[PDB]
Amino acid sequence: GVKTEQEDVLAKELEDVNKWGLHVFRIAELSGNRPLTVIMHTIFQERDLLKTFKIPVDTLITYLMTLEDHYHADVAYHNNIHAADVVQSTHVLLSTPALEAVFTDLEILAAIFASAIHDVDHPGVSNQFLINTNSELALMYNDSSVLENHHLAVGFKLLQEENCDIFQNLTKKQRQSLRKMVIDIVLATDMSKHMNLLADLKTMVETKKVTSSGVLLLDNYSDRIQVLQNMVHCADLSNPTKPLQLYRQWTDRIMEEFFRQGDRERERGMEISPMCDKHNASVEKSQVGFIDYIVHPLWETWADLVHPDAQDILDTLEDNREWYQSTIP
Ligand SMILES: [Mg+2]
Ligand SMILES: [Zn+2]
């Protein structure tokens, strides 16, 4: 009735589940390539979500293993490890002092479930690639947020497999509200929405109201969903805010995926996508442009929203940017 020795070492790595910089690659190795299942299970137990939503534990495990199996192990970045990392990063952002007791259990479930499914069945190429190749997915979704529409349909469709309906005890009212929030969050992970999300978060920082002692005031769906959308988008673009040991591994994986897309774009004579040309690549310059144009404006605005809970994350991001700028041949 006692853990194996590998399960013990896994359990001791999982004591960091509440911290920015969890060794998620190590958890992936120790769990037998089950990072998403074991991190989701830990978070569901820690936030008491099984008792609150009357989720049978065998149903939760069956769904999570099924969801994890529909991530592609032959994809370097957009796989179950990336899903697990965004879940755990969203878990940490939801615990920020500035957001203490703001969100309902259903909103918390929506943000975590959204994170878990947000990239499921990613084929390791971009929307633009799927549109330009006349792929079946681009035709199903009429070329509009093709991947993000697919991630949602799969995450939901998998609830219908044998003993997978983790929402079986929610009321129709709970399920309709959960589903709308999950759909709103995952569609907001399409980078084509980044500038609009960031504009709305900036507006929200300018007109920021707070409660008695810290803690934001969010008193309408538009505002509550905007913060949840920006939080998961922050978790999705969190790699450059992590310790450099972690960030680097993320950068190696994204560049593998992108160069592999570039190879397919070349070997068929298409325009080679930005950063996808392994012949003409400046990885260090790419990372500095990515931070200066996308990640830093986002995380700086988020840091403003939850002042000063995100100071160390913003500092780590600035250190990594200086590090990458300091290389640049
Ligand atoms: Mg995505
Ligand atoms: Zn993602």
From Swiss-Prot:
Chain residues that bind AMP: H78, D119, D236, N239, Q287, F290
List of residues binding Mn(2+): D119
Binding site for Mg(2+): D119
Tissue: Expressed in colonic epithelial cells (at protein level). Widespread; most abundant in skeletal muscle.
Active site positions, chain numbering: H78
Start and end residues of each PDEase domain: 2-329
Post-translational modification: Long isoforms that share a conserved PKA phosphorylation site in the N-terminus are activated by PKA through phosphorylation. Isoform 3 and isoform 7 are activated by phosphorylation (in vitro), but not isoform 6.
Chain residues that bind Zn(2+) 2: D119
Binding site for 3',5'-cyclic AMP: H78, Q287, F290
Compartment list: Apical cell membrane; Cytoplasm; Membrane; Cytoplasm, Cytoskeleton
Stated role: Hydrolyzes the second messenger cAMP, which is a key regulator of many important physiological processes.
Similarity field: Belongs to the cyclic nucleotide phosphodiesterase family. PDE4 subfamily.
Subunit structure: Homodimer for the long isoforms. Isoforms with truncated N-termini are monomeric. Isoform 3 is part of a ternary complex containing PRKAR2A, PRKAR2B and AKAP9. Interacts with PDE4DIP. Identified in a complex composed of RYR1, PDE4D, PKA, FKBP1A and protein phosphatase 1 (PP1). Isoform 5, isoform N3 and isoform 12 bind RACK1 via their unique N-terminus. Binds ARRB2. Interacts (via N-terminal region) with SHANK2 (via proline-rich region); the interaction is increased in a PKA-dependent manner.
Protein name in UniProt: 3',5'-cyclic-AMP phosphodiesterase 4D
Organism: Homo sapiens
Underlying gene: PDE4D
